[PDB]
Amino acid sequence: GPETRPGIYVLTSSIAHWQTLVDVARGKFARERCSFVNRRITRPRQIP
């Protein structure tokens, strides 16, 4: 949307290595990644 909407979470995971955790977090949050790049396209004057 026009305004950024934050989603706040508290996660429990068996992973402690950061790169593995961020891989799985990217796997879960892919729609937000596409939203981030789309935001870069559709509102070029704003820089997230």
Partner 1 sequence: MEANIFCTFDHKLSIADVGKLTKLVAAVVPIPQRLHLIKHYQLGLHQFVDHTRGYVRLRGLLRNMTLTLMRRVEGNQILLHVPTHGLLYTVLNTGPVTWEKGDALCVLPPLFHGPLARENLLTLGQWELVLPWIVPMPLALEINQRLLIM
Partner 2 sequence: METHLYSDLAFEARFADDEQLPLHLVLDQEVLSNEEAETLRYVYYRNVDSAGRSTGRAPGGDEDDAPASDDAEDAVGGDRAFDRERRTWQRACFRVLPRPLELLDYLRQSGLTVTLEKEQRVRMFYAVFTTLGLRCPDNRLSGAQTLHLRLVWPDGSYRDWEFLARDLLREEMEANDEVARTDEWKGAGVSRLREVWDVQHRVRLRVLWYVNSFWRSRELSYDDHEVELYRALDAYRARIAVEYVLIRAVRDEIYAVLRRDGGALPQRFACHVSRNMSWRVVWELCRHALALWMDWADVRSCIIKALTPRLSRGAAAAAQRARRQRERSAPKPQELLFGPRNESGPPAEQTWYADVVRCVRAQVDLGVEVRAARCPRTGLWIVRDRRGRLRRWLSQPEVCVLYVTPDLDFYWVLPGGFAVSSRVTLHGLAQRALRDRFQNFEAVLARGMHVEAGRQEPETPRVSGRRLPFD
Partner 3 sequence: TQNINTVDMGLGYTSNTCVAYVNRVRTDMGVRVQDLFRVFPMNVYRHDEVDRWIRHAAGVERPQLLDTETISMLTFGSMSERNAAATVHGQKAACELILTPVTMDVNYFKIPNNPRGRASCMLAVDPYDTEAATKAIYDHREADAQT
Instruction: Name the residues that contact partner 3, by CB under 8 A.
Output: 14-15, 20
Q: Quickly tell me which residue has 């729609």 as its tokens.
A: 31
Q: Does 20 bind partner 1 (CB under 8 A)?
A: yes
Q: Which does 33 bind (CB under 5 to 8 A by kind): partner 1, partner 2, partner 3, none?
A: none
Q: How far apart are CA 27 and CA 35, in angstroms?
A: 14
* φ, ψ of residue 8 in degrees (nearest 5): -110, 135
- In three-state secondary structure terms, 36 is helix
Residues at the interface with partner 1 (CB under 8 A): 15-17, 19-20
Tell me which residues touch partner 2 (CB under 8 A): 2, 27, 38, 41-44
